[PDB]
Enzyme design. Structure first.
Site, mmCIF file in Angstrom:
data_model
loop_
_atom_site.group_PDB
_atom_site.id
_atom_site.type_symbol
_atom_site.label_atom_id
_atom_site.label_comp_id
_atom_site.label_asym_id
_atom_site.label_seq_id
_atom_site.Cartn_x
_atom_site.Cartn_y
_atom_site.Cartn_z
ATOM 1 N N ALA A 9 22.431 73.290 61.008
ATOM 2 C CA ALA A 9 21.894 73.126 62.667
ATOM 3 C C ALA A 9 20.594 72.208 62.234
ATOM 4 O O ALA A 9 19.982 71.588 63.025
ATOM 5 C CB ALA A 9 20.323 74.783 62.714
ATOM 6 N N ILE A 13 23.227 66.201 64.409
ATOM 7 C CA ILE A 13 23.555 67.271 66.218
ATOM 8 C C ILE A 13 22.869 67.922 66.250
ATOM 9 O O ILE A 13 21.723 68.670 67.411
ATOM 10 C CB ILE A 13 25.442 67.118 65.804
ATOM 11 C CG1 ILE A 13 25.927 66.437 66.204
ATOM 12 C CG2 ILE A 13 25.023 67.887 67.424
ATOM 13 C CD1 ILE A 13 27.283 66.169 65.594
ATOM 14 N N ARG A 81 30.982 59.567 60.985
ATOM 15 C CA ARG A 81 31.358 58.673 59.758
ATOM 16 C C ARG A 81 30.562 57.551 59.823
ATOM 17 O O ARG A 81 29.828 57.694 60.405
ATOM 18 C CB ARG A 81 32.518 58.117 61.331
ATOM 19 C CG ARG A 81 33.656 59.015 61.463
ATOM 20 C CD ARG A 81 35.048 58.426 62.281
ATOM 21 N NE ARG A 81 34.653 58.491 63.786
ATOM 22 C CZ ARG A 81 34.743 57.808 64.343
ATOM 23 N NH1 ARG A 81 36.256 57.023 63.410
ATOM 24 N NH2 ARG A 81 34.710 57.644 65.587
ATOM 25 N N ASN A 94 35.208 67.859 55.490
ATOM 26 C CA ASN A 94 34.851 68.660 56.926
ATOM 27 C C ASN A 94 35.817 70.037 57.462
ATOM 28 O O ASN A 94 35.235 70.817 57.686
ATOM 29 C CB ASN A 94 35.043 68.072 57.781
ATOM 30 C CG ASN A 94 33.954 67.469 58.111
ATOM 31 O OD1 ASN A 94 32.540 67.587 57.332
ATOM 32 N ND2 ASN A 94 33.809 66.491 59.065
ATOM 33 N N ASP A 150 33.950 63.854 75.193
ATOM 34 C CA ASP A 150 34.881 62.534 76.453
ATOM 35 C C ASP A 150 34.755 62.954 78.229
ATOM 36 O O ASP A 150 34.000 61.442 77.984
ATOM 37 C CB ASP A 150 36.370 63.262 75.215
ATOM 38 C CG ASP A 150 36.402 62.680 74.383
ATOM 39 O OD1 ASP A 150 35.869 61.654 73.482
ATOM 40 O OD2 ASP A 150 36.954 63.527 73.879
ATOM 41 N N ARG A 153 31.024 61.045 78.064
ATOM 42 C CA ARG A 153 31.140 59.201 78.182
ATOM 43 C C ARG A 153 31.941 59.169 79.342
ATOM 44 O O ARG A 153 31.589 57.798 79.631
ATOM 45 C CB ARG A 153 32.022 59.505 77.248
ATOM 46 C CG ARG A 153 31.375 59.056 76.056
ATOM 47 C CD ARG A 153 31.758 59.663 74.366
ATOM 48 N NE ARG A 153 31.368 59.242 73.563
ATOM 49 C CZ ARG A 153 30.739 59.344 72.234
ATOM 50 N NH1 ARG A 153 32.825 59.318 72.332
ATOM 51 N NH2 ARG A 153 30.659 59.415 71.598
ATOM 52 N N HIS A 177 40.678 65.021 70.272
ATOM 53 C CA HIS A 177 39.534 64.229 70.270
ATOM 54 C C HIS A 177 39.923 63.020 69.388
ATOM 55 O O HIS A 177 39.186 63.659 68.036
ATOM 56 C CB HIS A 177 38.038 64.923 69.892
ATOM 57 C CG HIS A 177 37.411 64.757 70.277
ATOM 58 N ND1 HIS A 177 36.523 64.418 71.375
ATOM 59 C CD2 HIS A 177 36.112 64.190 68.834
ATOM 60 C CE1 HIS A 177 35.210 64.080 70.955
ATOM 61 N NE2 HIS A 177 35.582 63.398 69.587
#
Ligand SMILES: NC(=O)c1ccc[n+]([C@@H]2O[C@H](COP(=O)([O-])OP(=O)(O)OC[C@H]3O[C@@H](n4cnc5c(N)ncnc54)[C@H](O)[C@@H]3O)[C@@H](O)[C@H]2O)c1
Ligand SMILES: NC(=O)c1ccc[n+]([C@@H]2O[C@H](COP(=O)([O-])OP(=O)(O)OC[C@H]3O[C@@H](n4cnc5c(N)ncnc54)[C@H](O)[C@@H]3O)[C@@H](O)[C@H]2O)c1
Ligand SMILES: NC(=O)c1ccc[n+]([C@@H]2O[C@H](COP(=O)([O-])OP(=O)(O)OC[C@H]3O[C@@H](n4cnc5c(N)ncnc54)[C@H](O)[C@@H]3O)[C@@H](O)[C@H]2O)c1
Ligand SMILES: NC(=O)c1ccc[n+]([C@@H]2O[C@H](COP(=O)([O-])OP(=O)(O)OC[C@H]3O[C@@H](n4cnc5c(N)ncnc54)[C@H](O)[C@@H]3O)[C@@H](O)[C@H]2O)c1
Lengths: 314, 314, 314, 314
Positions: A9, A13, A81, A94, A150, A153, A177
């Site tokens: 958190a 993001i 990234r 990850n 996705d 967008r 994804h």
């Protein structure tokens, strides 16, 4: 009335995602977890004039308390990234993060919906499934790979090209994804849109490499944060609506699937009280879209197997 | 239809603020400015499925183009506090940032609503007023010191103590935005609430020191960002609604005032198409609240003078 | 044979300083302290192929174990300036930090040498003195305000203008460490140098505002870190040499002084086994330099009072 | 004396490295390059009282001026690891950074010693070599993959186990710079040390995992910076000594090699006036060590090809 945990958190993001959740009338308890800075983020948000109670938790010793009684867990936890990197460059770090956190979910809130944002989603969802199977609590209708960005967008790019209102546009996006596994079904777009093939191909590629466009624009300062917070919030709201009896709720998401030879695959899903009510499947598609699906399957299966094999070594 | 500029868009406040703005159908164009990172932020937000055209601008050479045609400019640009600092310890640094940014505003969008978030608000609003005066475009109805987070905090804290939904609580807060100058009028709270004096004093101290509470909780990682983004978004939305002819829009804000011997003061303002429609004034207040006003005035005058003196030497 | 503690070891100055100390055969034990990142910094430094054993300590629970048996403590812990800030804007923050950290020194390593880098030195040395008094272990020969960077800067600039080797240049700098209180005795420079009064004044201004010029060049990224690491390492090395019985070791430092009406003052100091062996005082100076001394005294007294006042409030 | 360029001078390694270089009487000129913050780092260092002329360069336009007339270039520029990453996971980002920066060196200072710190070294040296070939200035005796930190770690860890002065320990470390490619030749250590097998195995493993140990301990805040600054400086100093005609200067480094089937490989190198005077080879090793060489070769060849392939696809 939903109780939502956000694992990771304090990150790019995590913070704006936590903001959007805190601002929602659907959320009555927001538990924030991270390895750094979580207490200050929680205090910040606890001042906002909505009913959601905000509590912050810090470090693995407090992760169980964060998970107690949760209805939904969202996991933006992970490394983003840099320019040049693939999503698989992040796999090692990850995969450990996702396995460790989803293990705690399996132990302390196995009944919760698990919404994984951490990349590579094509591998991190298989990892989540195999961790849940390992603790004997695997329910494939409650584990979701968040591909919502996705779709978001796709809607934006279609709306710009045809001068439409993005709020009225809907483009199913299927597959996975990552790169060529992201398959936008422009032929199923509501409202109906006609592009010549060269423009359709340019639009398709833009959608596929949209994440990479943002990594380049940020020039070392990370990947998509704010739009992914929006996309993650959207998905969580959809899921919670469905959990309170809302009908006709449909979101694409990367899940356990029998629609193709891929064991995990993203398609439109009708959501209900028990998570996935019905996988609506691929449906009718063009030749161009059939070619992309067929081309995407080897990459998908390789990623799926890469995640499964990682859990095998635990 | 509202064209909103954010100056300082890459910061801790600027990014989630810009997100909330991008999410609203009230914003048709969102121009983002900073001295670093804005192109990546703009790229990120541009993918969200809402109408707002997002554009990014970077460095003083691009500031004029960020501002042209703007209806509203929000200015979170500025250095935040570390633990132990007063808001006034930021004056020297943030003064030059506000003066420079507001001069461009006076030159390139003099008709716009100017919303200063940068601290200390008690001094930076006067700096903005004097800068606008110096350029011959001073409209006191369009210059706003954003004190909204104080109101959000008050509402939340009161709601918590009385078991109410904070969405239906409203506490006018007046004076300024620094320590004892933050005066929550609990006597005017809707719904009616009555605390004994011991609790009312604590509640009042809590609200006044709320910013410092978040600073200490973040342990050097900055000040309120997500809650301030919430509060700032709310103020802009209120202001953009009023500009669209919505009626009954009331917000406290630190503005050019004649309600007291202070040149600048915060009271509930009725907002309209031209900015401030009517200053609703202090109103009927208790003896306790009357003392705090009296106690606050000397500090507010000093902060105001400080700001005016800074522009005097430019 | 010296055990040195660095308090604030994870900072901009702290890390390169700790590196320089780790490289020195004068240091046999190096203990590192901060509220963040210390274990990682200590792990990094502990791999370097020199004799000093390195250990990291994180948060106030581990502070006592850091200080036990310490011969010297260096305190870069503090907040640096942003462009536009006065050194007094950091007073409230750093005064608290210095007060806290020196209390632990007073309790756990009262016989250690205390070298304060944290600004403003003109007030933080007084703070260090009083805190040591409260604990009944005050020794004015062991408390040093580190002004060495000013001397280092003076040497570099004089050398640059005269085409000399800066290693062969020594400029006594007296008074304090802030603006006009920084007084370079160019008339006492070895080797002897001759400047017209116009060049001398500009050179003197360059030395006084040197820290500010670095703050400008860094454009918000902080203040002098690497050059201060050098200067702080130099002063600590001087002090540890003297403690080992090396003769003729002279350094300017801001200390308890009876050389002027100011109770704290910087002059060249003969260091020896007890810390300050002999204060060499101001010496013969030009009319120009006498003027600067006279003008600086009010500032110094104010700054001394402010720090002494602050301690009473605890 | 030596003219030294640092590319990536504003980073965690670059800044302290630059400080060590600045402090050294072997450096007459220090030119610093980065894409951000360089002018601030240079201003800072320019105040240090040593002879080295310091100049900062910022952005592609200024890179050539940084390189002109350089005897030695050190390249710490690159992205560091987070916990859970391999060095190879940095390849895609750092390949382009190294390619660009080494192309600049090939153009503007082809005769200089090129010291590549950027990871993964096992692949970035082949990149460097192929870039120099493309430009027709490839001299295999002047291109060095800096493995010096592994040797420094091995000296320290051996000295801690045996209770020795690490200044008097020298362990040859061969192979490459990643996991099991790092091969400490404890049998060739001076002084000769005899270790029980369980300690020898744990020692060997410690040396190999040391980088990951530091990354873990920094918990997301980067990798070894201060010890790598020490090691890189040491390597530069050995190189400059040998350039000034000093005899018997030996350093291990990952270079063009015909010692194993791997086309690049780290062994002790006698340095002279033109870089590598003589590759001293593997020498006599133990069975345990011979096996580590055998196990390392497949990974080295794979990392090498990866680097070569990257350049051939440009
Ligand atoms: N699904 C998508 O379409 C999509 C889109 C964008 C980004 N992402 C992914 O989201 C992830 C997070 O990205 P970001 O920009 O927020 O990165 P970030 O570095 O800004 O934040 C990551 C956060 O995760 C935390 N974290 C790390 N390890 C943790 C652990 N073990 N336990 C709890 N928290 C931990 C970090 O402390 C940090 O707060 C990345 O993997 C990124 O690739 C996914
Ligand atoms: N009004 C309130 O109640 C309230 C609440 C919280 C914070 N604040 C103030 O908001 C300000 C910003 O806080 P933050 O947490 O976002 O700080 P931050 O450091 O996270 O970001 C501030 C941003 O300002 C930018 N900036 C600095 N100078 C600039 C310039 N000259 N032109 C354009 N951009 C510039 C920086 O690049 C940075 O992106 C601070 O001054 C803080 O004191 C006010
Ligand atoms: N004497 C001089 O001529 C001179 C020159 C330059 C800078 N300075 C002073 O050096 C100080 C720090 O400079 P910097 O550039 O390293 O700043 P920095 O922010 O880079 O590092 C400060 C460090 O202090 C640590 N810290 C803060 N509070 C602490 C505490 N309570 N206990 C332990 N550690 C704490 C922080 O965690 C951080 O690691 C500043 O006060 C600055 O004014 C003095
Ligand atoms: N050889 C070793 O034993 C060893 C040891 C530690 C780290 N490393 C490697 O060195 C790098 C770590 O550096 P760091 O810790 O300073 O990381 P950092 O992030 O602190 O700094 C990296 C620097 O690279 C600069 N940079 C990026 N692109 C650049 C470009 N195109 N041109 C000029 N500068 C550019 C950045 O601005 C930054 O200043 C990584 O590649 C890491 O893997 C190697």
């Amino acid at each position: 009335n939903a109780k939502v945990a956000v694992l990771g958190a304090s990150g790019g993001i995590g913070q704006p995602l936590s903001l959007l959740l805190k601002n929602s009338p659907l959320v009555s308890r927001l538990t924030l977890y991270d390895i750094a800075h979580t207490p200050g983020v929680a205090a910040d948000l606890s001042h906002i004039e909505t009913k959601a109670a905000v509590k912050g938790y810090l470090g693995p010793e407090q992760l169980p308390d964060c998970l107690k009684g949760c209805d939904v867990v969202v996991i933006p936890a992970g490394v983003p990234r840099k320019p040049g990197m693939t999503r698989d460059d992040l796999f090692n770090t990850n995969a450990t993060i996702v396995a460790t956190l989803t293990a705690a979910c399996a132990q302390h809130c196995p009944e919760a919906m698990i919404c994984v944002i951490a990349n590579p989603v094509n591998s991190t969802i298989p990892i989540t499934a195999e961790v849940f199977k390992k603790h004997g609590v695997y329910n494939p209708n409650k584990i979701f790979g968040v591909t919502t960005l996705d779709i978001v967008r796709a809607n934006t790019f279609v709306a710009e090209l045809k001068g439409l209102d993005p709020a009225r546009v809907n483009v199913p996006v299927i597959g996975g994804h990552a790169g060529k596994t992201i398959i936008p079904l422009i032929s199923q777009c509501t409202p109906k849109v006609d592009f010549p093939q060269d423009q359709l191909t340019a639009l398709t590629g833009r959608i596929q490499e949209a994440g990479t466009e943002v990594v380049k624009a940020k020039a070392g300062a990370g990947s998509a944060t704010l739009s992914m917070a929006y996309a993650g919030a959207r998905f969580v709201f959809s899921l919670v609506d469905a959990m309170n009896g809302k009908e006709g709720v449909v979101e694409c998401s990367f899940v356990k699937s029998q629609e193709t030879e891929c064991t995990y695959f993203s398609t439109p899903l009708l959501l209900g009280k028990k998570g996935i009510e019905k996988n609506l499947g691929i449906g009718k598609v063009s030749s161009f879209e059939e070619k992309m699906i067929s081309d995407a399957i080897p990459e998908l299966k390789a990623s799926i197997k890469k995640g499964e094999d990682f859990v095998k070594t635990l």
